[PDB]
């Protein structure tokens, strides 16, 4: 394990703040499984945001952090703990694709449907 290899730009992820584990030391965002989804509607300026990140503890246990609410505010907060890795992934992809009607792998041809959830990259 040494010497340079594979250029590209290494991306960095930061455990969502609203999430409790965030404070806990060691809790990091499993891989780069972090995508933000938006949802706007022509109704009393009502907007919502869906976040799906995959966390992993030092106890070989993953946790699916799901947060939703109203675009702009904190909103609600939901968390799920999964013993198996794949199990968690299935939920991360299933849900995502279920909201974006697209495949995480084929994100290249991400088709944005009218009314459904969109795919954003947030702003630092």
Curated annotation (Swiss-Prot):
Q: Where is the WGR domain?
A: 26-117
Quote the subcellular location field of this record: Nucleus; Chromosome; Cytoplasm, Cytoskeleton, Microtubule organizing center, Centrosome; Cytoplasm, Cytoskeleton, Microtubule organizing center, Centrosome, Centriole
PTM annotation (ADP-ribosyl aspartic acid): residues: 108
Q: Which tissues show it? A: Widely expressed; the highest levels are in the kidney, skeletal muscle, liver, heart and spleen; also detected in pancreas, lung, placenta, brain, leukocytes, colon, small intestine, ovary, testis, prostate and thymus.
Modification comment: Auto-mono-ADP-ribosylated.
Quaternary structure and partners: Interacts with PARP1; leading to activate PARP1 in absence of DNA. Interacts with PRKDC. Interacts with XRCC5/Ku80; the interaction is dependent on nucleic acids. Interacts with XRCC6/Ku70; the interaction is dependent on nucleic acids. Interacts with EZH2, HDAC1, HDAC2, SUZ12, YY1, LRIG3 and LIG4.
Q: Which family does it belong to?
A: Belongs to the ARTD/PARP family.
Q: What does this protein do?
A: Mono-ADP-ribosyltransferase that mediates mono-ADP-ribosylation of target proteins and plays a key role in the response to DNA damage. Mediates mono-ADP-ribosylation of glutamate, aspartate or lysine residues on target proteins. In contrast to PARP1 and PARP2, it is not able to mediate poly-ADP-ribosylation. Involved in DNA repair by mediating mono-ADP-ribosylation of a limited number of acceptor proteins involved in chromatin architecture and in DNA metabolism, such as histone H2B, XRCC5 and XRCC6.
Annotated protein name in UniProt: Protein mono-ADP-ribosyltransferase PARP3
Q: Which organism is it from?
A: Homo sapiens
Please name the taxonomic classification of the source: Eukaryota, Metazoa, Chordata, Craniata, Vertebrata
Q: Which gene encodes it?
A: PARP3
Covered range of the whole protein = 41 to 157 of 533
